[PDB]
Amino acid sequence: RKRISNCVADYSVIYNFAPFFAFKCYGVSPTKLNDLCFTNVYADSFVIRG
Amino acid sequence: SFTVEKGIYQTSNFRVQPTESIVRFPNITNLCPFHEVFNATTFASVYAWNRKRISNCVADYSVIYNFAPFFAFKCYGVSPTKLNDLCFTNVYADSFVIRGNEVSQIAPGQTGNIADYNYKLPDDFTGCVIAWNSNKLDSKPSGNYNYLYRLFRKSKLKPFERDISTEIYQAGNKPCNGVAGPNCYSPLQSYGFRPTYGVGHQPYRVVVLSFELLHAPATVCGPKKSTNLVKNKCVNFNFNGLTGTGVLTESNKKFLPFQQFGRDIADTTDAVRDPQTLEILDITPCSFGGVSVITPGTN
Amino acid sequence: NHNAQALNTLVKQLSSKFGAISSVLNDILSRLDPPEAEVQIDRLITGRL
Amino acid sequence: NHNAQALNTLVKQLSSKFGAISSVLNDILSRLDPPEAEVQIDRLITGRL
Amino acid sequence: VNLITRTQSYTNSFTRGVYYPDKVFRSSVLHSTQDLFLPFFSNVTWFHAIHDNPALPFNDGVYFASTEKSNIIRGWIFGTTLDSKTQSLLIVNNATNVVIKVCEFQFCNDPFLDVESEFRVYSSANNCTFEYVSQPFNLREFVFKNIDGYFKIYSKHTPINLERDLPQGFSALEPLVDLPIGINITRFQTLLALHRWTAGAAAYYVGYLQPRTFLLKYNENGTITDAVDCALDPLSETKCTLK
Ligand SMILES: *[C@@H]1O[C@H](CO)[C@@H](O)[C@H](O)[C@H]1NC(C)=O
Ligand SMILES: *[C@@H]1O[C@H](CO)[C@@H](O)[C@H](O)[C@H]1NC(C)=O
Ligand SMILES: *[C@@H]1O[C@H](CO)[C@@H](O)[C@H](O)[C@H]1NC(C)=O
Ligand SMILES: *[C@@H]1O[C@H](CO)[C@@H](O)[C@H](O)[C@H]1NC(C)=O
Ligand SMILES: *[C@@H]1O[C@H](CO)[C@@H](O)[C@H](O)[C@H]1NC(C)=O
Ligand SMILES: *[C@@H]1O[C@H](CO)[C@@H](O)[C@H](O)[C@H]1NC(C)=O
Ligand SMILES: *[C@@H]1O[C@H](CO)[C@@H](O)[C@H](O)[C@H]1NC(C)=O
């Protein structure tokens, strides 16, 4: 788990870091992430089976 | 209930039933050139997408499955299995090549580099999108640089708009004067395609099929046999995909040469033009009504 | 006047889409497979009710 | 009393979600793309009607 | 070369510029439709060309009227830069055919037909994909617009009484051609035919369309005989509300 706060977020560059296919967002849309302003961000990373 | 009191009761309705069926399609004999759009061995860049117009032919979409190794269609206005019954006015095919993680951007109401500066779809799109992997054909060990995309533009693009001009994007106040200096950029970056990249960074060939709804005389649809025309009977009729049931009669309405249909207050088609013989017919529902039962008490 | 106006409004109400692709049942049935067709028919049914 | 109560109830009814993500049109418009936004707006419209 | 001059004036449009909104037959009904229409009682510009620096914006559509008989007007040109850096249309009409091409033409400041060489119109055309050839198409009225990459043209010619100003009454226009151009258009130009040059004169009326809602009345024969503009005055708004 990693906490992200007090920074400018540009989500588009995320497409240039990993060879994934598409996002799977629930509360919002991936294309609208560049306009909303949040309080804190959390990133949870792990590895599982297919 | 098992007992009925004396009185009159409204029970149900009566209606005359159809006798036969009628199919009326225009005179079309040629076959659509769907083969040329696929396996072209050469696709244009995304910033200059290739457009082809298809009209005046019989369309059989099933054979499309035999030309490219795609998985499934992604249609919006209609269903892929029903494409063999509808009859349209014109067909448009747009072909290009993009990256793997950009296929989601080819959809109505989408935002992104491709959607803003390369290819825009209308919010009321009626058509299908077919994208398939082409890593074996569009990748080189040293990297392919024959595919480019635009990145900088003053404003977004309207739907179905193409931009070919190659200039120098000017971020700063000073004029660029056609040199690649500071604050002046070239708005064309070449895709880097290599076979060792991940599945999300591999080239993908995309073809978009767009249909025009029936407003003018129809020109493209599938191979359905046209039967004879019979009047003065409650019959099932199919005129260029418009299905209905009723009685067809000669019409006295004075249609203009560019008019193909007639409507009423309730927004129901009541006047039609036969595709083969340009004659005006009017449609009236066959007889119907209500039935009441009069009886004394069952006792 | 009231009776005529009410009947005319009831008849004119049949041309609304109520959020569907089309206001004609035959077009919806011919342009879509059934499983996508019930969800389109339901809106029209609810509006008319 | 009846008139005031009816008007107050009508005004207070505007804060319901009716099964949507939010009861504010601007938040729904800013947090979602249009094609996901009509289905959210429709519920609010039906409830208010 | 530059050898043509132009002068301007203003006049009133009265109630002109009504066209059939769709290819659907209707009769004995009143229909409310929202589209691009020419507003009622609006200034339209009268241009007198005598033997031009046309920067005429396209806006959202163009209404063009001509009451001449000598038949000197031929075709139109559309673009946004009118140079080799952007494609431009070359609708040109003659006696036997009409030709529509949209290429990267390098147009001159004053384009005209020599009469029949286009060397005085453009210099070169390198890249383009769309071409069209068809049959060529008293007061003549034309309406040009473009929506979502579709360029649509309506037209109507009617015998007119001997009056300089626009007439009083109604006359509906009919569609001819819709094409998939799909480019950006901001400016447009008009071409003239000059024989050899001999002096000539021409006059025309230009107006701009706007998004408006209209109430059209259909007679029993299916033709439009009356219209009401819902954004003119409070009385018309009341009439539209009451239908
Ligand atoms: C389609 O194009 C490919 C390209 O290699 C070619 O081999 C093939 O013969 C063409 N025709 C068919 C029916 O696949
Ligand atoms: C269509 O073909 C039939 C022959 O089956 C012919 O009688 C009819 O005139 C044709 N109509 C048109 C519009 O070509
Ligand atoms: C048209 O313009 C003239 C002056 O240019 C002005 O006096 C007149 O009121 C205008 N007409 C309308 C309808 O705006
Ligand atoms: C009109 O132009 C077309 C194409 O430019 C040409 O084929 C035709 O001969 C011309 N007709 C006349 C009368 O100049
Ligand atoms: C076509 O466009 C390219 C780049 O947009 C340009 O270099 C070229 O001169 C144009 N004309 C031809 C004939 O290639
Ligand atoms: C067309 O070009 C003009 C001038 O560059 C620009 O302002 C405009 O945004 C472009 N697009 C449209 C739809 O007018
Ligand atoms: C309708 O057409 C008929 C037949 O030409 C004619 O007698 C009648 O006057 C027309 N009515 C109108 C309102 O145009």
Curated annotation (Swiss-Prot), chain B:
Changing A171V: Increased resistance to neutralizing antibodies. Residues 30-223 form the BetaCoV S1-CTD domain. Residues 133-204 are annotated as: Receptor-binding motif. The chain holds residues 305 to 603 of 1273 of the full protein. Changing N39Q: Reduced viral infectivity. It comes from Severe acute respiratory syndrome coronavirus 2. Changing L148R: Increased resistance to neutralizing antibodies. Decreases HLA binding to NF9 epitope. Increased binding affinity to human ACE2. The lineage of its organism: Viruses, Riboviria, Orthornavirae, Pisuviricota, Pisoniviricetes. Glycans are attached at T19, S21, N27, N39, N299. Changing N27Q: Reduced viral infectivity. This is Spike protein S1. Residues 15-31, 151-186, 215-237 are annotated as: Disordered. Residues 15-237 are annotated as: Receptor-binding domain (RBD). Changing A266D: In strain: Alpha/B.1.1.7. Binds to host ACE2. RBD also interacts with the N-linked glycan on 'Asn-90' of ACE2. Cleavage of S generates a polybasic C-terminal sequence on S1 that binds to host Neuropilin-1 (NRP1) and Neuropilin-2 (NRP2) receptors. Interacts with host integrin alpha-5/beta-1 (ITGA5:ITGB1) and with ACE2 in complex with integrin alpha-5/beta-1 (ITGA5:ITGB1). May interact via cytoplasmic c-terminus with M protein. May interact (via N-terminus) with host bilirubin and biliverdin, thereby preventing antibody binding to the SARS-CoV-2 spike NTD via an allosteric mechanism. Disulfide bonds join C32-C57, C75-C128, C87-C221, C176-C184, C234-C286. Changing G192S: In strain: Omicron/BA.1. Changing Q189N: Reduced host ACE2-binding affinity in vitro. Residues 99-101 are annotated as: Integrin-binding motif.
